[PDB]
């Protein structure tokens, strides 16, 4: 490798002569022969990198492409070899642009190793992928932009570096959005995130994704899941951010929880502790959560009018274009919950008294009935003739099965409970 360095130094002049004045071969020819596909002295890839750069500096970045295109085809010193320079070339292609983006664009699919896969050097052939996409994006290329980037997880890294990879996984997920298909994002998403926790957990990598995860959830509009995601790294951003920056998440979270038709965890998520995080409101939110057990649906338009500073009125972190995605969704939502305590509190009621309290037409009412009827979540009667709804009861539970056993459980409580204490009691008192 002496002549690898020596003749380089010699050809250095020889090129620099014609570089100043091609000698492209001169530099090339040495290693071209020497390393070729078969090491003569091999070389330092530098010797070729030298060659490339001397080319690079001298020639068009058009020529160098085609040049590299050719020289790559032979060998390099190893597949690794040239495409490092070819990578720095990309900045240089960028350190001009347009046609040199097109030259790049040329350079790109010349060999995959810039945006794509021959070598493993994804730490680069990933970069230019987006770097061309970033232009492709600007180019208005969408699918194709995504499509060059659609392949990361597989061809490219086995996640040799996630941190790199996850970014484009992200960006794939990101492009997946302008695309519109979560699924691209999905597999990525579903694979990736725990490992961010399994990172020295990197909030960004959460948050970034966690925001994708939001945006996932956004087009999704499954609000438990939405807020559930939120809730996850929402837990992180009291840790991470201040509560202050962190509240609007919550302010949307339970909001999302309420946006959700409900949730059972939402029923647990109800109080948290500091929740009604005890500065903003943030509270009517949970007060609505509290407005549940009392729910009315005389309230609905009231509370609507009552709250929309952001409250009913949110395009921010929620996609209600109108508040319908709150309001309408929340319409039934309250109505939904309204029926619950209603469910509790009615043995019988008229449709009217319902619609009276429920502020709705029969059919809607009927539907909402029919809903939880068809949901089986409530009881009712379908009675037009009476225009009255038995809220019913499953009287066939045979009841006294448990009830008399519970009537016994009463004693199995009472005499069992009460008994054990008494004689003990006055003796525990003694005296």
């Amino acid at each position: 490798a002496p002549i690898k360095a020596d003749k380089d130094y010699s050809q250095i002049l020889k090129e620099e002569f014609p570089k100043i004045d091609n000698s492209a071969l001169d530099q090339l020819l040495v290693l071209e022969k020497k390393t070729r596909q078969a090491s003569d002295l091999a070389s330092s890839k530098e010797v070729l990198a030298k060659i490339v750069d001397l080319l690079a500096s001298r020639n068009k970045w058009d020529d160098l492409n085609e040049q590299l295109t050719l020289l790559s085809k032979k060998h390099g010193q190893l597949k690794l070899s040239i495409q490092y320079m070819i990578q720095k070339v990309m900045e240089y292609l960028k350190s001009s642009k347009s046609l040199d983006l097109n030259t790049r664009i040329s350079v790109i699919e010349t060999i995959r190793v810039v945006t794509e896969n021959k070598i493993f050097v994804e730490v680069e052939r990933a970069r230019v992928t987006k770097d061309l996409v970033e232009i492709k994006k600007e180019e208005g290329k969408i699918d194709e932009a995504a499509d060059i980037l659609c392949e990361l997880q597989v061809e490219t890294y086995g996640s040799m570096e996630m941190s790199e990879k996850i970014q484009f996984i992200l960006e794939q997920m990101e492009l997946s959005i302008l695309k519109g298909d979560y699924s691209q994002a999905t597999v990525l998403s579903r694979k990736i995130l725990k490992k961010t926790f399994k990172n020295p957990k990197y909030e960004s990598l959460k948050l970034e994704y966690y925001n994708l995860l939001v945006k996932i959830s956004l087009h999704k509009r499954e609000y438990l899941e939405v807020a559930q995601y939120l809730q996850e790294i929402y837990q992180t951003d009291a840790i991470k951010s201040d509560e202050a920056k962190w509240k609007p998440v919550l302010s949307h979270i339970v909001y999302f929880l309420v946006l959700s038709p409900y949730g059972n965890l939402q029923n647990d998520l109800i109080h948290k502790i500091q929740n009604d995080n005890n500065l903003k409101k943030l509270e009517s939110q949970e007060s609505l959560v509290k407005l549940f057990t009392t729910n009315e649906l005389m309230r609905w338009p009231i509370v609507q009018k009552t709250y929309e500073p952001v409250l009913n009125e949110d395009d921010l972190a929620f996609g209600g274009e109108a508040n319908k995605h709150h309001w309408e969704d929340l319409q039934k939502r309250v109505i939904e919950h309204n029926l619950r305590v209603i469910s509790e509190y009615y043995s019988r009621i008229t449709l009217l008294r319902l619609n009276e309290l429920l502020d709705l037409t029969e059919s809607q009412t009927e539907t909402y009935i029919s809903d939880l009827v068809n949901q089986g979540i409530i009881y009712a009667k379908v009675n037009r003739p009476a225009k009255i709804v038995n809220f019913e009861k499953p009287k066939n539970s045979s009841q006294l099965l448990n009830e008399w056993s519970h009537n016994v459980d009463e004693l199995l409580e009472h005499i069992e409970t009460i008994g054990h204490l008494i004689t003990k009691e006055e003796i525990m008192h003694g005296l």
């Binding site: 597949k79 021959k118 061809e155």
Partner: protein, 161 residues
């Protein structure tokens, strides 16, 4: 066997039963006496046990001549099935369709390229050739599998000497 009847429904399979296929044909002293019984047992248990089938005797065979009709007795081993079938190219195409699904390949690897190459062969081998080639790309440090890679493996595997 009974445990399967204890577990009914169940399965009884036997890898290549032929190890126990022929008993002492003669005074064979050790280790040949039980292959009598074990077989006789199985015989007894095939040949002696109900048809209400919660469990099915299944046995692989490369070489069936070691066996005897006592297994081939009706009511017992009724249904013979034979692993082969001219690989008719569709099947290959299916095997080809099979593994290539699980196997990354560039734009050179081409099934119907091989499907003509491939006739009158065996699927294991086919199963080999696929990821035998699968080797070769990574054996060439190729993140992508070519037809060459296939061809190599194929050409490698068409004959082994």
């Amino acid at each position: 066997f009974r445990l399967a009847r204890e577990n009914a429904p169940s399965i009884i399979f036997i890898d290549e039963v032929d190890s126990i296929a022929t008993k002492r044909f003669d005074a064979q002293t050790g280790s040949d006496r039980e292959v009598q019984r074990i077989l006789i047992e199985l015989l007894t248990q095939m040949d002696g046990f109900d048809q209400s089938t919660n469990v099915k005797v299944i046995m692989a065979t490369n070489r069936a001549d070691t066996l005897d009709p006592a297994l081939l007795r009706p009511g017992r081993l009724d249904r013979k099935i034979e692993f082969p079938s001219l690989r008719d190219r569709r099947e290959r195409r299916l095997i080809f369709g099979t593994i290539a699904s699980k196997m990354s390949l560039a734009p050179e690897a081409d099934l119907d390229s091989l499907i003509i190459r491939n006739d009158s062969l065996s699927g294991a081998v086919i199963a080999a050739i696929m990821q035998e080639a699968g080797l070769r790309a990574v054996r060439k440090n190729r993140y992508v599998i070519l037809q060459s890679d296939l061809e190599e493996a194929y050409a490698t595997q068409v004959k082994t000497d």
